[PDB]
Amino acid sequence: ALTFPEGFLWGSATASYQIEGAAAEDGRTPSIWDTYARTPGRVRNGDTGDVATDHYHRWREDVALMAELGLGAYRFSLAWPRIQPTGRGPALQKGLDFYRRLADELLAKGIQPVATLYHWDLPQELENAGGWPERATAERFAEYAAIAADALGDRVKTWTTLNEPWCSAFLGYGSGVHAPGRTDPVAALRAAHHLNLGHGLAVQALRDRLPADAQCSVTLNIHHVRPLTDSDADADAVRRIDALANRVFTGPMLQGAYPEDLVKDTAGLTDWSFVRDGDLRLAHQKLDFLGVNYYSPTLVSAHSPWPGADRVAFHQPPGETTAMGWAVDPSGLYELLRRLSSDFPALPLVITENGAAFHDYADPEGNVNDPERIAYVRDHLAAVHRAIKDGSDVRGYFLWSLLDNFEWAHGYSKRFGAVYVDYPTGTRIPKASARWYAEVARTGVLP
Amino acid sequence: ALTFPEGFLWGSATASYQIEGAAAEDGRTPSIWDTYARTPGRVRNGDTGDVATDHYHRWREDVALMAELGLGAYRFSLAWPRIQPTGRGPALQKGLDFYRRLADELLAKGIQPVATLYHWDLPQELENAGGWPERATAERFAEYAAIAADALGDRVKTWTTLNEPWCSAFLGYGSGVHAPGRTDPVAALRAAHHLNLGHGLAVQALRDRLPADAQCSVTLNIHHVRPLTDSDADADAVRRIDALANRVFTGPMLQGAYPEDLVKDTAGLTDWSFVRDGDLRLAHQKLDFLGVNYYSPTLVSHSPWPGADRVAFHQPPGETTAMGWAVDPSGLYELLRRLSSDFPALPLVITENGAAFHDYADPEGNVNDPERIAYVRDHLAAVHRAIKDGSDVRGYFLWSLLDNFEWAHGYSKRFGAVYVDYPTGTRIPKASARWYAEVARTGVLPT
Numbered sequence: 068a069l070t071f072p073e074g075f076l077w078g079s080a081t082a083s084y085q086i087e088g089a090a091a092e093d094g095r096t097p098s099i100w101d102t103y104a105r106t107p108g109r110v111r112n113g114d115t116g117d118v119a120t121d122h123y124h125r126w127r128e129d130v131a132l133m134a135e136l137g138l139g140a141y142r143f144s145l146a147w148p149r150i151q152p153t154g155r156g157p158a159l160q161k162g163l164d165f166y167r168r169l170a171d172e173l174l175a176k177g178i179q180p181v182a183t184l185y186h187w188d189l190p191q192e193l194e195n196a197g198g199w200p201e202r203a204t205a206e207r208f209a210e211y212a213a214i215a216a217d218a219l220g221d222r223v224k225t226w227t228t229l230n231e232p233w234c235s236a237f238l239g240y241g242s243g244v245h246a247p248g249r250t251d252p253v254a255a256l257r258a259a260h261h262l263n264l265g266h267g268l269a270v271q272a273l274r275d276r277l278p279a280d281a282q283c284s285v286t287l288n289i290h291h292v293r294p295l296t297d298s299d300a301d302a303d304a305v306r307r308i309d310a311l312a313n314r315v316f317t318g319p320m321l322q323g324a325y326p327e328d329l330v331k332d333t334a335g336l337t338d339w340s341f342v343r344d345g346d347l348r349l350a351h352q353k354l355d356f357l358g359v360n361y362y363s364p365t366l367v368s369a370h371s372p373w374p375g376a377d378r379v380a381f382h383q384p385p386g387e388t389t390a391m392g393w394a395v396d397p398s399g400l401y402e403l404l405r406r407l408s409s410d411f412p413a414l415p416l417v418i419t420e421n422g423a424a425f426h427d428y429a430d431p432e433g434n435v436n437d438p439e440r441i442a443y444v445r446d447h448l449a450a451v452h453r454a455i456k457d458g459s460d461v462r463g464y465f466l467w468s469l470l471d472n473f474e475w476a477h478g479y480s481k482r483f484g485a486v487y488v489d490y491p492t493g494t495r496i497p498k499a500s501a502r503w504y505a506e507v508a509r510t511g512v513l514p
Numbered sequence: 515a516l517t518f519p520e521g522f523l524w525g526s527a528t529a530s531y532q533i534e535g536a537a538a539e540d541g542r543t544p545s546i547w548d549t550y551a552r553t554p555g556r557v558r559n560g561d562t563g564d565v566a567t568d569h570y571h572r573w574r575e576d577v578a579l580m581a582e583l584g585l586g587a588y589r590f591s592l593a594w595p596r597i598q599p600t601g602r603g604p605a606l607q608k609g610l611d612f613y614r615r616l617a618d619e620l621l622a623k624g625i626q627p628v629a630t631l632y633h634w635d636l637p638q639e640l641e642n643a644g645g646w647p648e649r650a651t652a653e654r655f656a657e658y659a660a661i662a663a664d665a666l667g668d669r670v671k672t673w674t675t676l677n678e679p680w681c682s683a684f685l686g687y688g689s690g691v692h693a694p695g696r697t698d699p700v701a702a703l704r705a706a707h708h709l710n711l712g713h714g715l716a717v718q719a720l721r722d723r724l725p726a727d728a729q730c731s732v733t734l735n736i737h738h739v740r741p742l743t744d745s746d747a748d749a750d751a752v753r754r755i756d757a758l759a760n761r762v763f764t765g766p767m768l769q770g771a772y773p774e775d776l777v778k779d780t781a782g783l784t785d786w787s788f789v790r791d792g793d794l795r796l797a798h799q800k801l802d803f804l805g806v807n808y809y810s811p812t813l814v815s816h817s818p819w820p821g822a823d824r825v826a827f828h829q830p831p832g833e834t835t836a837m838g839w840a841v842d843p844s845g846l847y848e849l850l851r852r853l854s855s856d857f858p859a860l861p862l863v864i865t866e867n868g869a870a871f872h873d874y875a876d877p878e879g880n881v882n883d884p885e886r887i888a889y890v891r892d893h894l895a896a897v898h899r900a901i902k903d904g905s906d907v908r909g910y911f912l913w914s915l916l917d918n919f920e921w922a923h924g925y926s927k928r929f930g931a932v933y934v935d936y937p938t939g940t941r942i943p944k945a946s947a948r949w950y951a952e953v954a955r956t957g958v959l960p961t
């Protein structure tokens with residue numbers, strides 16, 4: 068039985084388009100994912116987030132559920148399309164009101180609201196104007212950040228600018244398997260840069276409009292890259308992928324510069340002239356903690372999500388697999404945390420996303436048993452505890468996700484929730500893992 | 515497009531314990547599967563068929579769906595536990611009445627009732643007395659056949675004695691992964707013989723109590739065994755498994771003799787003294803057609819394969835289903851060609867073919883299963899080729915009309931053309947249901 072540090076934060080996480088629904092209600096206009104999902108062949112079975120879990124209408128019930136589970140924090144994302152339809156123009160108060168009431172209720176329940184400004188639902192109009200590969204998008208994001216802070220700054224004290232920019236840039240503009248579905252290596256790199264720029268401009272805006280005690284962060288899915296063999300070549304492959312997966316973001320955001328090896332690796336693709344003088348300084352803002360997302364390790368040896376790394380081959384890491392077919396290896400989380408502690412010793416860490424998809428089902432008696440999820444979470448929490456014992460400054464853990472939801476290109480075919488959702492009715496059924504996690508959250512002890 | 519013979523029969527199939535529920539109503543007492551499911555660790559998540567799809571109560575709705583889908587036949591099994599609780603004594607009219615009403619409803623809507631006498635739900639009392647390894651069970655089964663024929667003979671004109679005796683004998687008494695859960699190679703072989711015997715005695719009883727035009731059959735899951743390599747050693751492994759999986763039943767049932775190689779292969783286990791004088795002639799009864807069940811190929815190079823410890827099994831190449839089984843329609847084509855070669859004068863009916871996929875109902879209440887449509891279409895194409903090449907196949911039954919209790923897998927695997935939300939029992943015809951209906955209506959297979 069492992070005991071976690073005093074004050075360790077126990078929460079769950081969700082994203083706006085994945086759970087809200089009410090896609091065309093109260094002033095919300097389409098995001099790139101609305102467009103993408105409605106495009107034949109882009110999302111499994113043509114699923115869309117039109118309704119999803121209907122959280123927009125069931126929000127009060129969901130907060131009550133969080134309270135019953137004894138969670139200390141709730142990480143959610145703000146829908147740019149609801150707050151500032153089209154990505155420009157004035158704030159839409161009706162949109163902000165949804166988050167005002169949500170945040171107020173969370174606080175009334177003693178649950179800390181943690182808001183992510185951008186979790187992929189870019190207003191379609193901004194993509195029409197060029198999307199992330201277009202510089203203006205970064206400036207538009209900073210204006211949106213100010214709008215959000217002005218409206219919710221008095222109730223929300225923990226802010227995250229972006230969630231997994233690697234996915235937005237490389238899957239969104241590199242391999243095109245995520246909205247908006249474009250496939251151009253240079254567009255992907257430009258997108259990555261403007262996400263770095265937007266992030267910095269947003270933190271600047273947040274610091275200026277939020278109370279002095281407010282916390283600001285960014286959430287990155289830190290790939291833990293390992294080599295297939297001891298070969299010197301495979302070690303170079305690890306470097307290349309680490310550069311593209313992590314350092315293209317941690318470099319600018321946490322060090323104020325793009326890694327030189329990355330620039331060299333991509334020299335045949337671009338000269339990075341879109342990096343205007345001063346952009347790196349703006350991207351490099353002081354953060355209160357780094358949000359880390361992790362699910363599985365990476366093993367290595369024009370339409371790719373890895374511009375310039377065509378020589379690299381990827382392999383299935385060893386271990387049992389989840390419904391995503393991803394390997395289950397908690398050692399990757401431990402090693403990843405140690406790497407971060409070594410590279411950024413003074414930066415506190417928070418696991419903002421970790422969880423697993425399994426083929427859950429409600430039986431005739433109305434129960435949803437997911438012992439596999441309990442095992443996955445338990446094992447990964449053990450790895451986190453071990454990293455902490457070894458010196459890593461980890462301050463919290465957020466289980467992706469409180470609810471089964473729209474898992475992007477997979478549609479509703481993949482269930483990650485602690486709480487099962489019967490989509491046709493919207494009925495929530497806490498799974499066995501919800502009851503187990505609630506105990507961990509209430510005792511701070513991992514059995 | 516491929517056009518099937520205008521007289522080709524199109525149906526769907528189910529089994530009593532898998533769909534009925536009402537496990538303790540109207541006099542029904544525990545079958546070996548009720549007992550097995552109640553045993554910790556035997557069935558996924560402790561699932562049981564106590565409620566299942568609640569078909570015992572909602573059957574009228576299911577027959578209505580079949581009619582809506584234009585199916586020409588419905589294959590179902592009779593629950594011995596409902597008809598004769600202890601496996602002997604007075605037949606319960608309430609039990610018989612359920613099936614009489616069901617058969618009448620099917621006929622009223624132009625659907626041909628096809629009844630299977632035994633689909634694994636052996637009355638517990640018969641197991642307490644020895645189960646299938648005990649000869650009396652075969653005798654009791656034949657007396658049960660007469661009871662069923664007397665009560666339903668005026669309505670049901672197509673009868674099947676046993677469904678997949680290989681599973682009953684070897685999974686039930688060999689590896690113990692199926693009810694009753696015993697693990698004894700000799701018990702498994704004795705069970706196999708008594709299933710062979712019971713089958714024959716039942717056919718005799720059916721022929722005696724049914725109208726002259728009634729048809730009798732047996733359903734066997736015929737394993738299509740292939741060797742990993744072209745070695746003679748692998749070829750012999752194929753022979754050994756083919757003997758244990760198929761010929762241990764086809765030999766006695768269709769040829770009046772156990773294959774000599776099987777007797778040799780098992781000489782270290784038994785001398786088959788339980789095979790009494792006259793037993794082979796009894797097992798060898800003329801049938802109107804052979805029911806064939808097929809899902810995936812078998813690749814070879816406590817066990818359910820007595821005397822075959824020198825054989826290893828491998829994952830056959832191809833896409834996989836939720837069961838992890840390889841999808842290979844060529845196995846069905848080849849299997850049919852072999853049966854046509856071995857038993858040319860014996861008509862064939864595909865009594866079971868289908869696939870499990872991780873289906874879900876989306877927010878709009880739809881269940882899309884294009885993977886199942888592809889599976890069925892591909893296998894039907896294989897059947898059509900077999901027919902064109904000379905195989906006498908006269909019907910096809912999609913396992914299963916409904917998602918149901920999939921034995922040791924519990925409710926974790928969905929095979930239905932119709933989705934079932936277990937907590938409510940709500941039925942939602944999947945995309946495959948509408949697609950299959952079109953095929954069953956015109957007999958035209960769109961490729």
Ligand SMILES: OC[C@H]1O[C@@](CO)(O[C@H]2O[C@H](CO)[C@@H](O)[C@H](O)[C@H]2O)[C@@H](O)[C@@H]1O
Pocket residue numbers: 271348349351352353
């Ligand atoms: O020395 C940079 C250091 O101070 C912070 C405030 O704590 O930000 C200032 O410096 C930036 C870089 O020149 C400006 O872009 C920003 O507006 C300004 O307040 C931190 O972000 C940084 O770590």
